[PDB]
């Protein structure tokens, strides 16, 4: 019934695992010869047959068909077509339950290396641009209200730091994914005394699963991957929100390149930050995959259950999504143009009310009291229709006699950001230190 | 308006952070003296005042009130009540934006140590019981259908292995949580050249945040904790499903102790596995917290936003949930009674059809062909109204002449499980190895 | 910027909306000529080409390519290849923002109609089977422990009742999806005084959208469908759990047919309930889609934002999933075979302990004490090897002097079940009434 | 096993259901006497005590303690302390499985009624304000880029329209919650021929549950409420996003009142839109609750399972959250002040580029080419320092000979807006019509 089969994994999804499945079968065939189930004469026929399939796949031949239950079944059918009955010995002691997780892990191993590379390039793009644009200052925000002046590079580095934690989380997930489950059989293990150390070595896993029942029932590797990817997308969704708002004509801080923007087929004046919006939307898309698999696993009994097959489509979609989003984000950041003129112009006096308060603190006034006075000063300006940096010393002294002609030094945005030299701050020396820390972090991640 | 204030964090939630907030303020006051904002005379008054509050909290005095915005505000108000205006200097350069994440991290640091301890006791309980009940064999399942015989200890260890990965994930989350954000100010950093190394040391964090904007905008530590906790609960929900099914009169494999079960106020014969059901239900509860915070963070602009305050209730609920569930799970596993008689009795012949097939494989028949023959044998039994272990050699030979009197050795459940000696399998030697690996793993985790 | 396009929807997803897009464009064309933007002659040409594209689509021809942003641009580009510059007039006053919601809504109208047909068929299957096997009695469970005897038919009907509510919810969502958004333009509306009542009538919508900004910025209709589908699958995940457990050899109440079961390429004795498992798993799958659109929508500012383009794939996936799951469930319920023998055998005496306490309540003893007495009767039985069923009158007398020889009448399962005549109970008459109410309820839901 | 009880619901949550539990017990008592389980005299006593417990509850007295499993057991235990063993008769044929769904439903009936009142008040606030400021025009956005001019009132109404659908959905959910489950017993129903029509009538439900197994095993009514609430909060998260951005100094369109704003204890110049942010954040909070119950329900077998007890805290949290969020939003919309000046100033010429292309379409030029011409006009303007608004006729002539001096008429924002008269558009007459439709729609929703 084409219907019930419509509910199982699709053709394109199964095809994506075709090569790793063949790689897994080659390792298994070799261990079977060592275990005495295959003679060297038979092993050779099987390897040659499997290489035959590997060759066809590289030629774009699609092996799996709607007739085949899955790639495992498709490759076994194809082998039998190429070499006859000997192909059936390869099935000895092997379960789809271990092949499915082995193939998925091999695929993830390969996919994460590629994702990792693109993520580091994204981080690097942010870091290198922060180095170059280090002298630029614009408003920093809390509640989307102007808070205090900060360096544009501090802003870029904020996102690089968050992405760097994501890179670290990816690495940790990779270690647990890098554990080989082949040899777990259907749930009880392998009964031929197969050499799992041999399979681990040939398939390049770091170690082998400890318990056969767990190895076949769990999808922790999937959840964990989806979770890390979701938090990564959350970071990108916040950075996209930032750039989309900064791209408004109202803010005017920057403009994306033509490559990462599109116009409107109706409104001739439009230039839209499509790339950013797309990236933001993927957070929901990836989160849905995490929610999906968590629910699929919840309350299922041991050990293997057919429900588990929902992992394949979720993993592949997220891999592809991530791989694309990352390059697009890299493209967006490296090619956007900032307006230093508008960023500078956005720097307004009120943002220095905190500095104005600290000024009084330096002269002995408790911050609580100084906070009040500074607000009173902002109020006084707001009342006479002027900026606080315009109030005369006299208007200031009427708030507090502690104000002196030196107060003028407060109304300077460079002086403002430069007071934040303590590690992590927006001062130039702190931004420089960050750039160095991230370069070393990225070096370590790459190692 | 009591209404808009109803939407902010509650009293009991703010109170849970009262002591770490005081601990954070003490560290800050000291750095402020070093930074020249406080004289030794003032620092002493402030520390004494804060100790005063620490004393009151230990006496069960609730400091925060609906009048107070949050614990930070409540403690600052209380300090002012105890020592006067000098209390206001403590606010110098400090933002609620850094205090909120600092206090939450301190709380999580403390909560994870306690959760970790209980999780290891749960793992240990599973491992120690597996050692003792190592000779017990029962049916292993896939699709909730009898698959192959496995050791009850293999089953217990399956869950211990999964919990052990959770323990490892907890450790990784703990390292990123153990990074101190105090000194990030509102978003630009601290402007007094505060000694962050000094704060890190006194508050016991492993390091300090790299970027002030990120330190105040991110809640990765929260998401990550909620995510790891969710996967942990998923594991427990599957183990609960297992035990609930095994607790049915139909399976009859085991019975929970009176302590972890309840009766019915209407049906006098009932004995319900309440504990298990409760644990299973917490997976949804904890998942909801993860979904909650992910959505709260999605698309928010830099840096701090009031939305972020939803993290506190979610973290606390999950901590408390986890802390309780773990002890209950430990209680359930250590006190339940298995029926070795019913487990043994559940071992039926059909489960050895795979072994029956392998038997033919050993005699030269390809598994594919042997699989068919074994099924034919099961079919032959099913047709004459008997068990395959009852078929006479003659009925067997009619399926395949390769069957010999030695086939009798196939119908033995101990022989069945003992063939799975390859690492990870259900054989006794493999189960023993697992017990040792987990004891070393638990030793490492505890270190 | 190819990869940027890798973030777009797939060619297959857009192809899925090809026919409704042509249909929507055909209506706008006629409304355009009426608005005087198109001569009666320019219309005939445009309309002529649209029918052509339609013929290509029906022949499997795929017009959308990797170069086309979406299906809308594909059709415009294709129509231009067919009639030249004149095809460009179709664009007057039209925006993709209104076309995507128009197209997706048309698609959901056609898909929901098909889903309803199958849903109602599933309910009927449960109802009819319930009528036939109405005499079968088996254990009822709470906490998966034997509670009180119920009729297999009560069981089948509880699921039919839940699914009937799903069907009711599906129709309510149908009404809101059936509002035309065409004419909202990019956000401000249409500046040609286009006749929306005409568009509505031709595209067969029940009414038109009240506000243009809302119409192209909202995806409530998507969220609702996904919510209703999710809850529907939750019901199915529960029914699947039930049948999967009842399918175990341990329970032995029923066995699925070979058509909805599958074997194991390793273990020759296996006969697995794949159909049920696949159904249960789609609950997570559909929930995942609901979760993504909710997140996509959250915190987005007005009006249209590119983020919204994620609705299509989620809606299509859930449509095909639900359509297939419903038919599979129908086949499962229809062809499964129950074991009246095992179901009857499962009826154990302790399940009548409540009735036993009630027996004492009728004799005057307070429920609390009666409950306690029944409790002791079952404990006295077990510790004695036998079941409360075989306990001698003396043994019962030992627990309470109220126990007379007429207590024997409590140990009858039909009687137990026949005790529940109050509406909704498991007594035969009540089950029969349910069957009639659901027959009527399905009748009422079809007539709309 | 204390900690086991730490997994139970909280004392506060159970206390929240105290009054409805007493109310439900009062109905069952009368139905019991009628069923002959209680003498007319035993009833008067039982009923007498129940009213007493009710008086304690109204005096803030907390009856549920840490020792009590839930509120139901608390009330029974309390009633027993008041009248002795006789209170035990109330238990006949009753199960906690039916009491929890009965109690929670009663609670939701009372809570939903209050939520509706506030929701409709929020919509009216948006509607009335829309009527008053109907002449205000400002930028309309897509991708957060200036699109086409719209009326501030069109904007306010788009949100009112979305919220009106939420209100419609809330009432549909109300109907399904309004079905009485009392009388389903533990799962099999009631064995005393209890009068359900009597219970229904007294507890004020619209009808009774059709199947006892379904009634105590389902939580659809919970899932629905949470779904509707979630979508409702999504609308609010979007409106909040809008107003938060419009509140920036960069946009300067409006400013919230001091009552819905808050300062910074560090930065003395801050004035933050806390109310809006708090509202946006509750979208995640409520969604989280929907997600948990869906997961709680998923794959659970029939009928009752202890897992279901998680519904209470989720339902209560969402009720209080929604009730407060709605009033806060009403105050926000009501007291915010807009800057007609800044909104008018924001109107920039390029936003009329569509109208400019349309101007050429009226003169015969094909939309595609007209679009291109308009595009060049705006690029020609920018690269020239001025806006398409100031371009000389010659400059326009340079782009297309079709540009005459009457093109000047395109550069008027009222005209731009007044172009959208087709239903749902931003023209004044259309906005006025919307105001009337919503007034009627709110009227129709109250009358039920």
- DSSP string across D257-269: -GGG-B--SS-TT
User: For testing the chain D interface, which of B285, B318, B336 should be mutated: the one with the most D CBs within 10 Å?
Assistant: B285
Domain at A120, CATH number: 1.20.200.10
Q: Which residues contact D189 (CB under 8 A, 6 or more apart)?
A: C420, C422, C424, C425, C426, C427, C430, D183, D212
Question: In the block, which residue shows the tokens 């809006």?
Answer: D276
DSSP per residue over B263-316, as a string? --SS-TT--B-HHHHHHHHHHHHHHHHHHHHHHHHTTPPSS--GGGGGHHHHHH
Task: For Cα atoms C256, C259, C260, give the angle at the middle one, nearest 5 degrees.
Answer: 50
Q: Which residue of A has its CA nearest to D268?
A: A375
Our CA-based measurement puts residue D248 at a distance from the nearest CA of chain C, in whole angstroms, of: 14
Contact A307 C6 (CB under 8 A): no
Q: In whole angstroms, what is the distance from residue B443 CA to residue B432 CA?
A: 17
**Domains contained in chain D, number:** 3
Q: In whole angstroms, what is the distance from residue B213 CA to residue D435 CA?
A: 45
Neighbours of C142 (CB within 10 A): 26
Q: How was this one solved?
A: X-ray
Q: Is residue A4 part of a domain?
A: no
D387 with D272, same domain: the answer is no
Q: Are D138 and D343 in contact (CB under 8 A)?
A: yes
Our CA-based measurement puts residue C217 at a distance from the nearest CA of chain A, in whole angstroms, of: 14
Beta strand ranges found along A50-163 (DSSP E): 137-142, 145-151
- The helix or strand, by DSSP H or E, that contains position A208, with its residue range, turns out to be strand A207-208
Q: In whole angstroms, what is the distance from residue A200 CA to residue A216 CA?
A: 16
Task: For Cα atoms C99, C105, C106, give the angle at the middle one, nearest 5 degrees.
Answer: 90
Domain at C407, CATH number: 1.10.40.30
Residue A268, classed as helix, strand or coil, is coil
Our CA-based measurement puts residue A361 at a distance from the nearest CA of chain D, in whole angstroms, of: 13
Helix intervals (H) in D205-346? 212-217, 220-246, 274-297, 311-335, 340-345
C352 with C393, same domain: the answer is yes
Q: In whole angstroms, what is the distance from residue B67 CA to residue B85 CA?
A: 20
Contact A267 D147 (CB under 8 A): yes
Q: In whole angstroms, what is the distance from residue D103 CA to residue D101 CA?
A: 5
Q: Which residues contact D439 (CB under 8 A, 6 or more apart)?
A: D127
Number of A:C CB contacts under 8 A?
Answer: 162
Residues of chain A contacting B86 with CB distance shorter than 8 Å: 366
Token pair listed for A262 = 């599109």
Token pair listed for D418 = 């007044």
Residues of chain D contacting B282 with CB distance shorter than 8 Å: 7
Chain length of chain A? 447
Our CA-based measurement puts residue B235 at a distance from the nearest CA of chain C, in whole angstroms, of: 16
Cis peptide upstream of residue D278 (ω within 30 degrees of 0): no
Token pair listed for D404 = 């005459």
C246 with C333, same domain: the answer is yes
Token pair listed for D128 = 């009335």
Distances in whole angstroms, Cα of residue D202 to Cα of each of A301, C422, D45, D180, D205: 44, 17, 19, 11, 8
Closest CA to B233 of B293, B317, B150: B317
Q: Is residue D3 part of a domain?
A: no
Question: In the block, which residue shows the tokens 């790689």?
Answer: A23
Q: Which residues contact D218 (CB under 8 A, 6 or more apart)?
A: C162
The catalytic position among A12, A207, A257, A264 is A264
Cis peptide upstream of residue D303 (ω within 30 degrees of 0): yes
Measured between CB atoms, which of D266, D270, D354 is closest to A145? D270
Q: Which residues contact D289 (CB under 8 A, 6 or more apart)?
A: B288, B292, D226, D230, D314, D317, D318
Q: In whole angstroms, what is the distance from residue A283 CA to residue D117 CA?
A: 35
User: For testing the chain B interface, which of C139, C140, C143 should be mutated: the one with the most B CBs within 10 Å?
Assistant: C143
The catalytic position among B113, B207, B264, B408 is B264
Q: How many CA atoms lie within 13 A of C406 on its CB side?
A: 5
Q: Is residue D1 part of a domain?
A: no
Q: Are B301 and B350 in contact (CB under 8 A)?
A: no
Q: Which residue of A has its CA nearest to C300?
A: A241
Q: Are A102 and A180 in contact (CB under 8 A)?
A: yes
C17 is in which domain, residue-wise?
10-106+178-217
Task: For Cα atoms B124, B125, B128, give the angle at the middle one, nearest 5 degrees.
Answer: 80
DSSP per residue over B293-304, as a string? HHHHHTTPPSS-
Q: What is the set of active-site residues of D?
A: 143, 264
D164 with D273, same domain: the answer is yes
Q: In whole angstroms, what is the distance from residue D153 CA to residue A411 CA?
A: 41
Number of A:B CB contacts under 8 A?
Answer: 335
Residues of chain B contacting A298 with CB distance shorter than 8 Å: 234, 237-238, 283-284, 287
Residue C91, classed as helix, strand or coil, is helix
Closest CA to D185 of C148, C135, C434: C148
B413-429 burial string, b = 16+ CB within 10 Å, else e?
A: beebbbbbbbbbbbbbe
Q: Are B103 and B20 in contact (CB under 8 A)?
A: yes
Strand-pairing partners, residue C179, are: C207
Q: Which residue of C has its CA nearest to B374?
A: C268
Q: In whole angstroms, what is the distance from residue A336 CA to residue A132 CA?
A: 14
Contact A146 D294 (CB under 8 A): no
Q: In whole angstroms, what is the distance from residue D185 CA to residue C420 CA?
A: 10
Q: Which residues contact B195 (CB under 8 A, 6 or more apart)?
A: A422, B31, B34, B35
C281 with C402, same domain: the answer is no
Residue D308, classed as helix, strand or coil, is helix
Active site residue B379: no
DSSP per residue over D55-85, as a string? HHHHTT-----TTSSSHHHHHHHHHHHHHGG
Q: Which residue of D has its CA nearest to B324?
A: D3
Contact C291 A288 (CB under 8 A): yes
Q: Are B158 and A303 in contact (CB under 8 A)?
A: yes
Token pair listed for C328 = 């599979």
* Cα end-to-end span (Å), chain A: 51
Q: Is residue C323 part of a domain?
A: yes
What own/partner pairs with CB < 8 Å and gap ≥ 24 does A57-65 have? A57/A18, A57/A19, A57/A22, A62/A11, A62/A15, A63/A15, A63/A18, A64/A11, A64/A14, A64/A15, A64/A18, A65/A11
Overall resolution, Å:
2.2
Distances in whole angstroms, Cα of residue C199 to Cα of each of B169, C20, C100: 57, 14, 16
Residue D137, classed as helix, strand or coil, is strand
Q: Is residue C237 part of a domain?
A: yes
Q: Which chains touch B (3 or more CB pairs under 8 A)?
A: A, C, D
Q: In whole angstroms, what is the distance from residue B348 CA to residue C249 CA?
A: 11
Q: Which residues contact D37 (CB under 8 A, 6 or more apart)?
A: C361, D89, D92, D93, D192
Q: In whole angstroms, what is the distance from residue B419 CA to residue D248 CA?
A: 72
Strand-pairing partners, residue A236, are: none
- DSSP structure class, residue D272: B
Q: Which residue of D has its CA nearest to B317?
A: D7
Contact C88 D283 (CB under 8 A): no
Domain at C82, CATH number: 1.10.275.10
Contact A300 D299 (CB under 8 A): yes
B59 with B161, same domain: the answer is no
Q: In whole angstroms, what is the distance from residue A169 CA to residue A171 CA?
A: 5
- The helix or strand, by DSSP H or E, that contains position C147, with its residue range, turns out to be strand C145-151
Q: Are C226 and C290 in contact (CB under 8 A)?
A: yes
Our CA-based measurement puts residue B120 at a distance from the nearest CA of chain D, in whole angstroms, of: 18
The catalytic position among B143, B249, B265, B405 is B143
D170 with D27, same domain: the answer is no
Our CA-based measurement puts residue C306 at a distance from the nearest CA of chain A, in whole angstroms, of: 6
Chain length of chain C? 448
Residues of chain B contacting D306 with CB distance shorter than 8 Å: 272, 274, 277-278, 281
Q: Which chains touch C (3 or more CB pairs under 8 A)?
A: A, B, D
Contact D266 B325 (CB under 8 A): no
Contact B287 D285 (CB under 8 A): no
D343 with D260, same domain: the answer is yes
Task: For Cα atoms A252, A255, A258, give the angle at the middle one, nearest 5 degrees.
Answer: 150
The four Cα atoms A323, A327, A333, A337 give a dihedral, to 10 degrees, of -140
Residue B170, classed as helix, strand or coil, is helix
Q: Which residue of D has its CA nearest to C164?
A: D210
Q: Are C178 and C207 in contact (CB under 8 A)?
A: yes
User: For testing the chain C interface, which of B267, B356, B410 should be mutated: the one with the most C CBs within 10 Å?
Assistant: B267
Residue A386: φ, ψ to 5°: -145, 175
Q: Which residues contact C327 (CB under 8 A, 6 or more apart)?
A: A3, C118
Residues of chain C contacting D31 with CB distance shorter than 8 Å: none
B261 with B323, same domain: the answer is yes
Residues of chain C contacting A320 with CB distance shorter than 8 Å: 6
Q: Is residue C173 part of a domain?
A: yes
Expressed in percent and rounded to 5, the helix, strand and coil fractions of chain D are: 70, 5, 25
Q: Is residue B57 part of a domain?
A: yes
Our CA-based measurement puts residue A156 at a distance from the nearest CA of chain B, in whole angstroms, of: 10
The catalytic position among C10, C113, C264, C408 is C264
Residues of chain A contacting C292 with CB distance shorter than 8 Å: 284-285, 287-289, 291
Q: Which residue of C has its CA nearest to A238?
A: C299
Token pair listed for C40 = 């009666």
Contact C269 B351 (CB under 8 A): yes
Residues of chain B contacting A300 with CB distance shorter than 8 Å: 238, 241
Number of B:D CB contacts under 8 A?
Answer: 162
Residues of chain B contacting A435 with CB distance shorter than 8 Å: none
Q: Is residue D293 part of a domain?
A: yes
Contact A185 B305 (CB under 8 A): no
Contact D162 C355 (CB under 8 A): no
Contact A284 C267 (CB under 8 A): no
- The helix or strand, by DSSP H or E, that contains position D118, with its residue range, turns out to be helix D96-132
Token pair listed for D38 = 């209680």
Q: Which residues contact D273 (CB under 8 A, 6 or more apart)?
A: A143, A144, A145, D243, D244, D247, D256, D260, D261
Contact D302 C420 (CB under 8 A): no
Cα A246 off chain centre by:
23
A243 with A368, same domain: the answer is no
Neighbours of A43 (CB within 10 A): 20
Task: For Cα atoms A182, A185, A187, give the angle at the middle one, nearest 5 degrees.
Answer: 120
Contact B300 C299 (CB under 8 A): yes
Q: Are D75 and D65 in contact (CB under 8 A)?
A: no
Question: In the block, which residue shows the tokens 């408003």?
Answer: A139
Token pair listed for B422 = 């390859």
D120 with D173, same domain: the answer is yes
Question: In the block, which residue shows the tokens 């009955």?
Answer: A85
B148 with B234, same domain: the answer is yes
Residues of chain A contacting C281 with CB distance shorter than 8 Å: 296, 306-310
Q: Are D350 and A269 in contact (CB under 8 A)?
A: yes
Residue A211: φ, ψ to 5°: -135, 125
Residue B405, judged by CB atoms within 10 A of its CB (0-12, 13-18, 19+), counts as: exposed
- The helix or strand, by DSSP H or E, that contains position D337, with its residue range, turns out to be strand D337-338
């Amino acid at each position: 019934d084409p219907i019930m089969q419509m509910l199982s994994t699709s053709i394109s999804t199964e095809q994506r695992l075709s090569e790793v499945d063949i790689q897994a079968s080659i390792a298994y065939a070799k261990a079977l010869e060592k275990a005495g189930i295959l003679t060297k004469t038979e092993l050779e026929k099987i390897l040659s047959g499997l290489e035959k399939i590997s060759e066809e796949l590289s030629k774009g031949v699609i092996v799996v068909t709607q007739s085949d239950e899955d790639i495992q079944t498709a490759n076994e059918r194809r082998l039998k077509e190429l070499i006859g009955d000997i192909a059936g010995k390869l099935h000895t002691g092997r379960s789809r339950n271990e092949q499915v997780v082995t193939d998925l892990k091999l695929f993830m191993k390969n996919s994460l290396s590629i994702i990792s590379t693109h993520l580091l390039q994204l981080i690097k793009t942010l870091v290198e641009r922060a180095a170059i644009e280090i002298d630029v200052i614009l408003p920093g925000y809390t509640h989307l209200q102007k808070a205090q002046p900060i360096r544009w590079s501090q802003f870029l580095l904020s996102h690089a730091v968050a992405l760097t934690r994501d890179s670290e989380r990816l690495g940790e997930v990779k270690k647990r994914i890098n554990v080989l489950p082949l040899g777990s059989g259907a749930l009880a293990g392998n009964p031929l005394d197969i050499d799992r150390e041999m399979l681990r070595s040939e398939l390049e896993f770091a170690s082998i699963s400890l318990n056969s029942m767990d190895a076949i029932s769990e999808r922790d590797f999937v959840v964990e991957f989806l979770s890390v990817a979701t938090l990564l997308l959350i970071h990108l969704s916040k950075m996209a929100e930032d750039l989309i708002i900064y791209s408004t004509s109202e803010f005017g801080f920057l403009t994306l390149s033509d490559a990462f923007s599109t116009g409107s087929s109706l409104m001739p004046q439009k230039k839209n930050p499509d790339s950013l919006e797309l990236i933001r939307s993927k957070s929901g898309r990836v989160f849905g995959r995490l929610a999906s698999i968590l629910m699929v696993l919840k309350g299922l009994p041991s050990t293997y259950n057919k429900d588990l097959q929902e992992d394949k489509e979720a993993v592949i979609d997220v891999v592809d999504t991530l791989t694309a989003v990352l390059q697009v984000a890299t493209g967006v950041i490296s090619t956007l143009q900032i307006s230093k003129e508008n960023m500078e112009k956005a720097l307004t006096p009120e943002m220095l009310a905190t500095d104005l308060a600290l000024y009084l603190v330096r002269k002995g006034m408790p911050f609580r009291q100084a906070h009040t006075a500074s607000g009173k000063a902002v109020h006084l300006a707001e009342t006479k229709g002027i900026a606080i940096n315009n109030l005369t010393l006299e208007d200031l002294k009427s708030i507090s006699p502690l104000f002196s002609s030196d107060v003028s030094q407060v109304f300077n945005f460079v002086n403002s950001v430069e007071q934040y030299t303590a590690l992590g701050g927006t001062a130039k020396s702190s931004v420089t230190t960050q750039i160095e820390q991230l370069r070393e972090l990225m070096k370590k991640q790459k190692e």
